[model samples]
Target: MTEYKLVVVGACGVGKSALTIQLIQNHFVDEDSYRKQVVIDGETSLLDILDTAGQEEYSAMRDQYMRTGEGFLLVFAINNTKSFEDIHHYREQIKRVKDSEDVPMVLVGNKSDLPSRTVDTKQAQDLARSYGIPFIETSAKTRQGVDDAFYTLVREIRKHK
Candidate 1:
C-alpha cells in the first residue's frame, strides 16, 4: 500500500482532533497525531495524519507539519469565525513549506451539526474558491461529511499525481 501524509490544522477547539479521531479511529482516538489506512480507486493508501495542537506555543511546529504533509485538510469550526479566519495562516504555511502554490488541499468546515453556527457557508465557500480547493462541511458528532472530506482529498491527490 502506498502511504500519504496528511496534516489536519486549525485553531484550537475547532474540531481538528475530533475530525481526525472520527476518520482514523471511528471512535475517540488519542493525541496530537495518528495514522489510518484508506482505499481509493482500488489502491490501498496509508494516511499518516498529524492532528496538530492549535496554540501559540505550537506555532514553531507548523512548518514541520507542513513539510511532512503531501496533502492537507485545513479544518475550521463552523461555529467560530476566528477559526475560519485562521485558515489563511495554515494555507500560507503549506504553500511556503511545499514551495508550491498548487499543493493539494481541502478546506473543511467542521461542526456542521451545530445549530448555532457562526461561519456562513458562502463565506467558507468563497475562501475555498479563492484558494482553488474543494470545501466541505462536516459534523464529527453525527459522522456526517467526515468520510467525504477525506475521500475527496484522496481523490484530488490522486488526480494531481
Candidate 2:
C-alpha cells in the first residue's frame, strides 16, 4: 500500500483552516491527523494529513515534517499578495530541511470565489513552472479544484519515486 504525507499551516486569513475542513469533512478534533484511502488515476494511495499549526507542537512538529512529507499543497490567498510571498518561503524551508533542491509540491491560488485580481495568474503560473510544480487555483468554499491539488501531488510523488 502506498502512503502520502500531507500538511497544513494556517493563519486566520489564508483560510487554510477552512480548506482542510472542507477537504476532510470537518472532523479536526485533534492536532493528530486524518487518514483516507483514495484511488487516483486507477491506483490506490493513502492520504495522511496533519494540522501543523499548533504553538505547543510547532518546533517538534515541523522538525519532523520536512522529513516525513512526501507531497505538499503550498497555499496562498488570491485576495492577499503577501501570502504569495509566504508560500515561497515554505518551498525554501521545506527544501532546506529536506536538503534536496527538487521536492514534490503544488502551488495553490486559493479563494477563487473572491473577486480580487491582486495576484496575477500569469506570474503565479510562471513561478510554478520555475519550481517545476503544477499551479492549481482552488476555491475551498465550493471545493473546486481541491481534489486536483492533492491528487496532483500524489501523482508527482509517484513520478519522483
Candidate 3:
C-alpha cells in the first residue's frame, strides 16, 4: 500500500475545512473542524490535516500547522483577495518549520464556482509555479477539481518514492 504524509493550510474562511471535508467525505462543512484523517482508493495514506482558525488573531496557530507539514496544500478562497495576499506569509512559515527547500506543495484556489469574484487564475498559477509546485482551481460547492487536487498530490508523493 502507498502511504503519504499530507498537510492542508491556509487562511481561515478560505474553505480549508470545506476542502478537507469535501475530499475525505464528499460532504460540506457548516463549521470549522480540527485535524481529521482517512484513507482513499485503498491506499493507507494518512492525511494529518492541520486546520487552523484563519483570521489574523489566529496567526500563532496557523504558524504551528505550517511548521509540521511535509507536503502542504496552500489553499485560498478565490473570492477573497486577502487570502491571496497572505500566501507569502504562509510560505515563510513553512520554510521555517521544514527548514528545507525541497518540500512539496500544491496551490489550491477554492471557490472556483465564483468566477466573477475570483483572484486572477494567472496570479495563483504564477505563485505556485514560483515555488515549483502545481496549481489547481477548485470549488467545494460545485465539487470541482477537489479529487484531482488530492490525486495530484499523491502523484507528487509517489514521485519522491
Candidate 4:
C-alpha cells in the first residue's frame, strides 16, 4: 500500500478541523490528527492527515506540518471573506516549505450550512483555477462535499506518486 501525508490549513476557525473530522470520523468528533485508508480503481493509499493550527501563535507548528505534507487541503470558511483571502498566503507558504510550486493540493470552502456567506463559490473556483488545483465547497455540520473534498485530494496526490 502506498502512504501519503496531507495537511489541512486555513485561518483560525475556518472549519479546517471540522472538515477533517467529518472526513475521517464520518461525523464531527471535535477531532484532530486523522488517518484514513482508501482504494480507488484498484489503487490503494494510506493517508496520514495533519490538522495544522491556523492561529498566529502556531505559525511555527504550521510550518513544520507544511514541511512534512505531501498533499494539502487548503480550506476557508464560506462565511468569512478574510479567511478566503488568506488562502493565498497559505499557498505561498506551502510553496516555500516544499520548495516546489507544483505540490498536490485542493482548495476547500467549508461551512456551507451557514446562511451568511461572504465568499462566492465562483470566486473560490477562479482562485483554484489560477493555482492549478481543484476546488470544492463543504459543510462539515451537514457532511456535504466532505468526502468528495478528501477523496479528490487523495486522487490528486496519487497522480504525483
Candidate 5:
C-alpha cells in the first residue's frame, strides 16, 4: 500500500496539534505540550500527519517540515483574529520552504465550535480561492469537521495519483 505525508502547521495556540491528535487519538493533548509527532500505523500509513509547532521558537523546525511535506494544512484559530490575519505569513512560509508554487495546501479555520467568535468564514474562503487551495473549518474539541478537513486534503492529493 502507498501512503502520503500531510504536515499541519499554524501559529502557536492555533490548535494545530489538537487537530491532528484528535483526528488520530479521538482526544486532545490539553495537558502539556512542547512539540510532538503522532504516527499512525507503520511508516506506510494511510495518512502520516506531522503536526509542527508554529511559535517563532519553532520556526526553523517548521521550515524543515514544510520543505518535505507532500501536503500542507495551514490552520488558524477561529476566535483569534491575529491568527486569521497571519495566514498570509504561513502561506508565504510554506511557499518559501516548499520553493515551489505547485505544492498542495489547504486553509483550515480550526476551533469552529465557537461560532460566536468566528471572524469570517467568507474571508477564509476568499483567501483559499486566491491561493487556489481548499478551505475548511474544523473543531477538535467537538470533533466537528475534523475528518472532513483531513479527508478533503487527502482526496485532493490523491486526485493527482
Candidate 6:
C-alpha cells in the first residue's frame, strides 16, 4: 500500500483542522496528524495527514512539513474574507519549499453551512483555475466535501508522479 503525506495549511480560525479531523476521526502529534486507509481508484492508501496550526507562530514548522508533504489542502472559511485572501501565501510558500511549479494542491472552502458567504464560490473556482489546482467547498459540521478534498489531493499526488 502507498502512503499519502498530506498537509493542511490555512488562515487561523478557518476550520482547517475540522476538515481533516472530520474525514479522519470518522476513520497525533507535531501539530496534529491522523492516519486512515482509504480506497481511491480501486487502490488502498494510508493517509498521514498533518493538520498544522493556522497561526504564523510556527511558520518554520510549516516549512518542514511542506518539504515532505505529498499533497495539501488550502482551506479558507467561506464567511471570512481574510482567510480567503490568505490562500496565496500558503500556496506560494509551499511552492518555494517544494521548489516545483506543479505540486499537488487543493483549495478548500470550509464552513459551507454558513449562511453569510463572504467568499464567493466563483472566486474560489477562478482562483483555483489560475493556480491550476482543484477547489472544493466543505462543511466540517456536515462532512460535505471533506472526503472529496482529501481524495482529490491524493489523486493529484498520484498524477504528479
- Candidate whose lDDT is highest: 6
Instruction: Give TM-scores for every candidate, taking all chains together and pairing residue i with residue i.
Output: 0.90, 0.87, 0.80, 0.89, 0.81, 0.91
| Model 5, C-alpha of 119: deviation from truth (Å) | 1.3
CA lDDT scores, all candidates in order: 0.84, 0.76, 0.74, 0.84, 0.76, 0.86
Model 2 — which ten-residue stretch has the worst lDDT? 24-33
Q: Is candidate 5 or candidate 6 better by TM-score?
A: 6
Where does candidate 4 stray beyond 4 Å? 29-31, 54-62
Q: What tens-digit string does per-residue lDDT give for candidate 1 at 34-60?
A: 887777778898988887745545766
N/CA/C clash count, model 4:
0
> lDDT score, residue 159, model 2?
88
Residue 119 CA displacement from its true place in model 3, Å: 1.0
For model 4 the local lDDT of residue 14 reads 86
Q: Estimate, for each residue in 23-80, the C-alpha lDDT of model 3 and write its tens digit.
A: 7778874534333445555666656565553454667655665665557778888899
Mind giving the per-residue lDDT tens digits that candidate 2 earns over 74-145? 888888888887777778777888888878888888888888769888889999999989998888787888
**Residue 109 of model 4: what lDDT?**
93
Q: Count the backbone clashes (under 3 Å) in each candidate.
A: 0, 0, 1, 0, 0, 0
Candidate 5's residue-wise lDDT over 39-104, tens digit each? Answer: 333323466677765554666655666676788788898799988888898778777877887778
Q: List the residue pairs that clash in candidate 2.
A: none
Give the per-residue lDDT digits (tens) of candidate 4, residues 1-161. 78878898888888878887777777774445778887755778777888864564567766777887888999999999998989999889889889997899999999888899899999999999999999998999999998888888878987887
Question: Candidate 2: lDDT of 90?
Answer: 77
Worst 10 residues of 6 by lDDT: 24-33
Error of 6 at 29 (Å): 20
Clashing pairs in 3: 12-54
> How good is model 2 by TM-score?
0.87
**What value of lDDT does candidate 3 attain over all alpha carbons?**
0.74
Q: How far is 1's C-alpha from truth in model 2 (Å)?
A: 1.7
